[PDB]
Nucleic acid binder design. Structure first.
Length: 288
RNA sequence: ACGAGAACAUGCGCGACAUUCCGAAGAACGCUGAA
């Protein structure tokens, strides 16, 4: 996991749903009911409602708590847990990581299997992949999605990502050497056909200047989300033409209006450490 | 002082045997909008 990886759980929580300490630089992920009943008991529920009515757009919970000056230990009692944060801008949005019924951090094996199937294509019953081992929640830190299209820009999409598996095959259908060779070939194709376009852009120059890409980057996979359209899907020029056509067909606003073929289709992460990072990249190891 | 009188359509018996709700699925893509 050389880059922050977020596997969504279908739940997106707003700024007002959780607390964000800017000075302490930590995000308190809180459940709803505990906070609601705490405010009902302490008389802060009507105050919270008036706060929501006063400022519709920005309703950060931490600023409201500071305005009411509530005790920090009274904050901890309704907080589900806390996470270390990284922002390039209070946070706007937040995407939660996938948690099973018990609540441990884990990457589902289905994500790995789907990524492997996509990269290998170019059936699939023999390759049986199971869930990865549980990970302690402290590795779950909140990162930001940043778009680099000739210029870097922070985005409101903040995502809970992991900080930077048992599998069985049948010998005839799949082989470890063949699948790893195909993974490496797919990564090389991704580098040659699309990564060079981002290298040439000035935003890419800024990214490499700060050492954003790992020096080492073998077997590299795009496990989680935020990786891009070059993944999750040919001659180079024909491929670019197909992506441009499909983007024009689907996204009427950004791509449909503009007729000219961009420099690279598609046109497009900050951490408290000076090194820049990219979302979704992972390094894998297979043992028999 | 009835082609009549008596006379169980009854005895035994498993709706059973064989059967993977399963195979295929990355929670992900565009990155921007307003002032």
């Amino acid at each position: 996991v050389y880059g922050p990886v977020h596997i969504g759980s279908g739940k997106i929580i707003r700024k007002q749903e959780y607390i964000y300490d800017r000075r302490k630089s930590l995000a308190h992920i809180v459940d709803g009911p505990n906070l609601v009943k705490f405010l009902n008991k302490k008389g802060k529920f009507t105050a919270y409602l008036q706060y929501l009515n006063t400022t519709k757009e920005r309703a950060d919970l931490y600023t409201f708590l500071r305005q009411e000056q509530i005790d920090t230990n009274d904050w901890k009692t309704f907080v589900l847990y806390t996470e270390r944060v990284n922002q390039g801008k209070g946070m706007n949005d937040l995407h939660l990581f996938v948690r099973d019924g018990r609540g441990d951090l884990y990457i589902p094996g289905s994500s790995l299997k789907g990524a492997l199937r996509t990269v290998l294509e170019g059936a699939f019953h023999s390759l049986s992949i199971s869930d990865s081992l549980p990970i302690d929640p402290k590795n779950l830190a909140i990162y930001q999605k940043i778009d680099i299209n000739k210029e870097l820009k922070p985005m409101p999409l903040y995502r809970e990502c992991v900080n930077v598996f048992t599998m069985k095959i049948n010998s005839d259908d799949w082989t470890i050497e063949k699948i790893e060779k195909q993974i490496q070939q797919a990564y090389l194709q991704y580098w040659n056909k699309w990564f060079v376009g981002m290298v040439t852009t000035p935003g890419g120059k800024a990214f490499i200047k700060g050492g954003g890409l790992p020096s080492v980057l073998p077997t590299v996979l795009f496990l989680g989300g935020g990786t891009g359209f070059p993944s999750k899907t040919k001659p180079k020029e024909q491929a670019q033409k197909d992506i441009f056509a499909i983007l024009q067909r689907r996204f009427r606003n950004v791509y449909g209006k503009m007729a000219t073929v961009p420099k690279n289709v598609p046109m497009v992460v900050n951490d408290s450490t000076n090194k820049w990072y990219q979302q979704g990249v992972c390094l894998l190891e297979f043992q028999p």
